[PDB]
Write an enzyme that holds these catalytic residues in place. Sequence first.
Site, PDB file in Angstrom:
ATOM      1  N   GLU A 166     -22.289 -14.519 -16.091  1.00 55.34           N
ATOM      2  CA  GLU A 166     -22.921 -15.437 -17.043  1.00 55.34           C
ATOM      3  C   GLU A 166     -22.061 -15.630 -18.283  1.00 55.34           C
ATOM      4  OE1 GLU A 166     -25.287 -17.217 -16.141  1.00 55.34           O
ATOM      5  OE2 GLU A 166     -25.719 -16.058 -14.358  1.00 55.34           O
ATOM      6  N   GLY A 275       4.565  -2.291 -20.439  1.00 55.72           N
ATOM      7  CA  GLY A 275       4.731  -0.846 -20.308  1.00 55.72           C
ATOM      8  C   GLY A 275       4.981  -0.434 -18.875  1.00 55.72           C
ATOM      9  N   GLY A 323      -4.908   9.382   3.076  1.00 57.76           N
ATOM     10  CA  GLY A 323      -4.857   8.609   4.304  1.00 57.76           C
ATOM     11  C   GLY A 323      -3.469   8.111   4.642  1.00 57.76           C
ATOM     12  N   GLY A 338       3.576   8.540  -1.464  1.00 56.46           N
ATOM     13  CA  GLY A 338       2.648   8.441  -0.362  1.00 56.46           C
ATOM     14  C   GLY A 338       1.464   9.395  -0.448  1.00 56.46           C
ATOM     15  N   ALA A 340      -0.547  12.822   0.794  1.00 56.11           N
ATOM     16  CA  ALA A 340      -0.624  13.451   2.114  1.00 56.11           C
ATOM     17  C   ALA A 340      -0.778  12.360   3.166  1.00 56.11           C
ATOM     18  CB  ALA A 340      -1.811  14.404   2.162  1.00 56.11           C
ATOM     19  N   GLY A 349      12.925  -4.744  -4.201  1.00 61.38           N
ATOM     20  CA  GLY A 349      14.155  -4.774  -4.975  1.00 61.38           C
ATOM     21  C   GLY A 349      14.274  -3.672  -6.004  1.00 61.38           C
TER      22      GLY A 349
HETATM   23 CA   LIG Z   1      14.546  -0.733  -3.716  1.00 68.35          CA
HETATM   24 CA   LIG Z   2       0.278  -0.993 -19.574  1.00 71.86          CA
HETATM   25 CA   LIG Z   3      10.973  -2.145  -6.220  1.00 74.65          CA
HETATM   26 CA   LIG Z   4      -1.050   8.862   1.890  1.00 75.22          CA
HETATM   27 CA   LIG Z   5       2.758  11.270   3.128  1.00 72.25          CA
HETATM   28 CA   LIG Z   6       4.139  -2.865 -16.357  1.00 70.36          CA
END
Ligand SMILES: [Ca+2]
Ligand SMILES: [Ca+2]
Ligand SMILES: [Ca+2]
Ligand SMILES: [Ca+2]
Ligand SMILES: [Ca+2]
Ligand SMILES: [Ca+2]
Length: 453
Positions: A166, A275, A323, A338, A340, A349
Site C-alpha cells: 500500500e 562496499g 546443501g 561452498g 559443507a 571474471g
Molecule cells: Ca575469476
Molecule cells: Ca554495503
Molecule cells: Ca568474479
Molecule cells: Ca554447500
Molecule cells: Ca563444499
Molecule cells: Ca558491493
Amino acid sequence: GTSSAFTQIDNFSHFYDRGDHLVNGKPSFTVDQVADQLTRSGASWHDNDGVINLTYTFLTAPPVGYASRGLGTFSQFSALQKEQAKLSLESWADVAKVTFTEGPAARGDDGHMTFANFSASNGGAAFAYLPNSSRKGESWYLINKDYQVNKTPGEGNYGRQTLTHEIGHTLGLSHPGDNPTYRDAVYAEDTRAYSVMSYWSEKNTGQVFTKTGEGAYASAPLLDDIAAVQKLYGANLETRADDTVYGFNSTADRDFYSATSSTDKLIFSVWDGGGNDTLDFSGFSQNQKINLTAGSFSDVGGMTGNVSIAQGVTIENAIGGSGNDLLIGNDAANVLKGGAGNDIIYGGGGADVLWGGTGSDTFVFGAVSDSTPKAADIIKDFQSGFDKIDLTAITKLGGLNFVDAFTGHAGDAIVSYHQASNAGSLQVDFSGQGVADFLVTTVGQVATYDIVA
Ligand SMILES: [Ca+2]
Ligand SMILES: [Ca+2]
Ligand SMILES: [Ca+2]
Ligand SMILES: [Ca+2]
Ligand SMILES: [Ca+2]
Ligand SMILES: [Ca+2]
C-alpha cells in the site's frame, strides 16, 4: 560438449532470464520494462532538494467526510501496526530518495501520508491512493472479526507486505496490470516473486517459497519494485554503503535481510549502496543456487527464486550452506565459499578467492578470462582426489595435454606444486602461444586427475 557441472552453472545462470520471449504465453518483461509498467500512471510526489521528504500521520480520528466512505468504524493503528509501518516505510526509504518522517503535514514537506484502520469488510482488505489523486498519501487497512490480517503485521506475513504494498501504491507504483487471475497479467513476471505490487503468487512463475497452509511474503520491496521506485525518485546510494553481510550473521540491520535459523523463509531483493558485501546463507542445510550477478535471482534456504540482487548493485561474496550448492560470481573479485556438501563454484571474471569447504567441490571456469596469470583465482582449500577444477566449458571436452613445460601447442597444461608452501597451480596455454594464458592457484596439491577438461 561440457560437463554436467558447467551445464548446471550455465542453466541456473540463465534460469530467470527476462525479456524478448514468451513465458506462460505472455511477454517476459525485463526489470526496466516492469519499472515502466509499474509507473505507468505517471503519478508521483514532486520535489529541487533532490529528495522527496514526506511526513505521515497515524490518524487518531476520522477525517472530515470519513463516514461517507462506507468504511464503518474508524480505529487508529495499534502500536504494532505503527512499528511495522515504520519498518515498511524504511525499506522504501532505503532504496529510493524518499524520506518518511512522522508528523503533521508541513509547509516544507513534499507531501503527507495518513494511515488508519476501518472495520467494514465492504472497504476491501486495504487500499491506497496514487500521489496525483485527491486522497494522495492515504492508505487504509481493514480490521474486523472476519479479517484479522492487518491486526498483527510482522516480518514475512501478508500484514507486513500489505503495508509495504500500500505504501508502494501511495508512492506512485500501480499494480502490474489492470474474476481476474494471473492469466490476465500483461507480462509474465507479474507475481510476488518479482514485485510486492502483484496480486498473483510466485507459483504462477514456478518459484516455490512455501507449502499449502503457510504464508510467505516478502516484507520489503522486491526487484522490480526497487527498479520502479528508483525510476520515480532516484536510487538511495547512501544506504549500507560500507561492508554488508546479508542473511545469517547479517549486518544489514533489517528484519527482512536477517536469518537466524535453517527454517527461515527469506524473500528479499538486495539493495546496497557500496562496499564489500556478502550473501551469507551458511545457516541453511538445503541446496542453494546463489547468483551474485546484478539483478539476478537465487534459490535460497530451500526455496527457489526467493532472493535477488537489485539492478545497479554489486555483491562481492557468497557463502553457501550445508546443501549441494551452486555459487556464481560476477566480474568483481569474489570470495565464494561452498560450505559443507558438494558444491559447484563459478568465479566469473576477476581474481576470485574460492573455498570449497568440506565435501567434494567443483570449481568451474567458463572462459579463459575467468582466471588469467595476471588475475588468478585461488582455491584456498583444494582437496585433491575429491575436488575438481572444471574447464570443460572452455575445452568442450577436447581434453588437455599435461606436460612439464609449455611446448607451444594449444591445450598444454601444467599442474605444479610447491611443497614448502602447500601451494599448487594449474596453468594452461589454451591459445597455444607457448605461455600460460590461464592460471588457477590453490592451497593444497592439485593432480592431473582433479581436472575435468
Ligand atoms: Ca575469476
Ligand atoms: Ca554495503
Ligand atoms: Ca568474479
Ligand atoms: Ca554447500
Ligand atoms: Ca563444499
Ligand atoms: Ca558491493
